[PDB]
Design an enzyme around this catalytic site. Sequence first.
Site, PDB file in Angstrom:
ATOM      1  N   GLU B  16       0.795  -1.239   0.000  1.00  0.00           N
ATOM      2  CA  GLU B  16       0.000   0.000   0.000  1.00  0.00           C
ATOM      3  C   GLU B  16       0.827   1.289   0.000  1.00  0.00           C
ATOM      4  OE1 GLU B  16      -2.683   1.354   0.158  1.00  0.00           O
ATOM      5  OE2 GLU B  16      -4.217  -0.127   0.502  1.00  0.00           O
ATOM      6  N   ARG B  99      -6.376   1.550  13.744  1.00  0.00           N
ATOM      7  CA  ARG B  99      -5.026   1.810  13.086  1.00  0.00           C
ATOM      8  C   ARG B  99      -5.262   2.942  12.034  1.00  0.00           C
ATOM      9  NH1 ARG B  99      -4.558  -0.068   7.877  1.00  0.00           N
ATOM     10  NH2 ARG B  99      -5.642  -2.037   7.334  1.00  0.00           N
ATOM     11  N   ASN B 101      -4.933   4.261   8.203  1.00  0.00           N
ATOM     12  CA  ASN B 101      -4.999   3.585   6.934  1.00  0.00           C
ATOM     13  C   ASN B 101      -4.199   4.542   5.983  1.00  0.00           C
ATOM     14  OD1 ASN B 101      -5.587   1.134   5.323  1.00  0.00           O
ATOM     15  ND2 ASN B 101      -7.400   2.115   4.420  1.00  0.00           N
ATOM     16  N   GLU B 119      -9.009  -5.332  11.907  1.00  0.00           N
ATOM     17  CA  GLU B 119      -9.944  -6.379  11.514  1.00  0.00           C
ATOM     18  C   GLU B 119      -9.434  -7.756  11.926  1.00  0.00           C
ATOM     19  N   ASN B 152      -9.734   5.558   3.128  1.00  0.00           N
ATOM     20  CA  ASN B 152      -8.863   5.177   1.991  1.00  0.00           C
ATOM     21  C   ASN B 152      -8.325   6.290   1.098  1.00  0.00           C
ATOM     22  OD1 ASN B 152      -7.316   2.960   1.353  1.00  0.00           O
ATOM     23  ND2 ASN B 152      -9.121   1.625   1.670  1.00  0.00           N
ATOM     24  N   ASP B 202     -10.228   1.895  -3.352  1.00  0.00           N
ATOM     25  CA  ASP B 202      -9.205   1.750  -2.327  1.00  0.00           C
ATOM     26  C   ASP B 202      -8.280   3.090  -2.470  1.00  0.00           C
ATOM     27  OD1 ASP B 202      -7.142   0.988  -0.753  1.00  0.00           O
ATOM     28  OD2 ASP B 202      -7.146  -1.181  -1.164  1.00  0.00           O
TER      29      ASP B 202
HETATM   30 ZN   LIG Z   1      -5.499   1.618   1.067  1.00  0.00          ZN
END
Ligand SMILES: [Zn+2]
Lengths: 297, 297
Positions: B16, B99, B101, B119, B152, B202
Site C-alpha cells: 500500500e 489503526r 490507513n 480487523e 482510503n 481503495d
Molecule cells: Zn489503502
Amino acid sequence: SIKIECVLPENCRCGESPVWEEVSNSLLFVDIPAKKVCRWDSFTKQVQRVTMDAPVSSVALRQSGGYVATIGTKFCALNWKEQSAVVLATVDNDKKNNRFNDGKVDPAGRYFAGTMAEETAPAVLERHQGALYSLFPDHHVKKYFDQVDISNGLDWSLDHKIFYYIDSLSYSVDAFDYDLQTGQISNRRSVYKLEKEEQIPDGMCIDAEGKLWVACYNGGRVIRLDPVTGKRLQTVKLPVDKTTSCCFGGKNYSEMYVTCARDGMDPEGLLRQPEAGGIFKITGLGVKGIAPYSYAG
Amino acid sequence: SIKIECVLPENCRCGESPVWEEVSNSLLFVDIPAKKVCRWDSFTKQVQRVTMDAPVSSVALRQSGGYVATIGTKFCALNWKEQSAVVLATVDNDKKNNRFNDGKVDPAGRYFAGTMAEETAPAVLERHQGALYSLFPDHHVKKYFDQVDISNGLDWSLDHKIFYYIDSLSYSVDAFDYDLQTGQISNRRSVYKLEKEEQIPDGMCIDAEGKLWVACYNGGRVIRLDPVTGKRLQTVKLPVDKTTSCCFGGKNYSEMYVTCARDGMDPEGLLRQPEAGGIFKITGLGVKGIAPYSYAG
Ligand SMILES: [Zn+2]
Ligand SMILES: [Zn+2]
C-alpha cells in the site's frame, strides 16, 4: 399468447408488495413513499386506501384476521376497518435512517422482512445498512444477517427446503437451505446474476413449477429463472421501465400482477409511459403461481 | 498502447501507500501487516525494508529530511538510516483497536491520514470506528469527521480547491471544497459510484489533466474518473485481483505504480495469480501524474 393490461392506473410513487387475497379476490399492495396500503377488489374494481405515519414497505395476510405490514422499522398488525395499527416488534434501533423494504410470510407463518438505508440519493451515498429479519408467531424477532444494501424479493421452494433472496445492489438471486421447523437459513449461494439489461433485481415470486419471477427495476421486464439450473427461461417486457414486484393471483393463481414506480421519472419518460406507477395484470403466461402464507401471530 | 510489468514479485501481505521518491528514483510503499516500510530502487531493482513495531499504513516524504509515517494510531517521523520512529502525535487513544490507513501530504505540507478499526480472522470488523485527521506543520492534529469505515485514497485538484476522499465501505469517491490556506474542507458530495464489478474503491491519485485514478480492491483494476462529469473514462485491468492503491512515478511521472495484496486468498488463487502482492508499473496511459508533496513540519 400474452395480454398485458393496466388494471388500476394508480400512479404510485412507488408501487410494491403485491399480495393476492383469495378469500375475497382482492390484491393488496403498498405505495412506499406515499405511506399507503391499498386493497383492490378484482370484482367490484374498487380500491380502498389507508395512509400510515412512515414508509409502508410491505403487507401480508394475518391468519387471525386483518393484515401485517412493515411501517418504518416496525412490524405492525393492521385493523383495516379501524384504520389502526398495533406495533408487534421494532428492529434497527441503532440506525438513524433505516426502513423496512421487501417482506413476505414463511411456509410456517413467520413474517420475513429486511431493511435498507433510506435513500433517493443514490450516487451520493451508502450502504450495507440493512439486515434480514423474521417476526415469529410469538411476536419475537430473529436477525438472520447484516451488511444488506436493499432487502428485496424473497420466496421459498415448493418443498419448503430452500429460501430465495435478493439484495438488490448485489445483482444476484441467492438461495439458502431453509429449515421449515425452526426458520434457520444456511449455505448462502448465488443462483442467478443479472445481465446488465435486466438492471436492478427487485421483487420476486415462485411459480407452481418452482421457477422464479424477478421484477427488474429500470428493466421494464420481469424474468423467469430456473433456480436449479442457474439459467433465465423467459423475459416478459412491460410498457413501463420501473417494474418493482410481482405475484400470482386471479382464478387458480393464473394471472400475474405487477407493481411499478412513477417516482424518479422525468417529463419525457412520463409522456410515453403515461401508466407508470399502475398495476398491471399479465394473462397467458402459461404458468400458475401458488397462494401466499399468512402470518401465525 | 498500455504496457503492464510486474517490476517486483514482492508478494506483499498487503502492499500500500506507493510514493515516488524522484531524487533517488525509488518507489516507497508499505506492507501493512508485515509492519514494513519499503523502498524499491528502480535502477538496481533491489528492495530495502525497515520493520516497525506496529502496522505501518502509509509513508510520506519529510521536507526537512527522512520520512513521516502512520504506525498504529500514531503519526511518526522516520529516520531511515537508523530505523526507529519518533512519535509526533497520537490519535484515537480511546479506540484500542484502531489503526491509521491511508495518508498523503497536502499541497501545503500537511499530512492527511484517516483511521479504521482493525480487523479480524484477519481482519475484518466493526464498523464506523474511523475518523479523518491531518497533521499540521506545527505537529498539532486537526480532526475532520468520523463514523468512517476504511479511510482510503485521497488527493487534491490541480487548482487546490477540491479535496477528493475515498471511504472504502462507502463505495463512493467523494469531493469536498478545499481551502489551501487553512486546510479546511466543506460541501461533501459523491462525484462517483462504483459498479458491482469494480468492487471496493481503495487508493487514488490525481493526473495532470485533473482526472482521478482509483484502484479497485478485488476488481483487479484501476479506473480513471472524471470528477466533473462523474463518468468512468477507462479501465486498466491487472494480472491480479487485490489491486490496493496507485501513484505516478518514473521520469516526470509518466508511469503509474499499482500495489496489491495477497492476504485473504486461498491456496489455488495464489497459483492462478503467481504475482499476488507485487508491484506493477503501467506505461502508456497518455497522461502524467504530479510529484508528491513533502511534509513541512
Ligand atoms: Zn489503502
Ligand atoms: Zn422492492
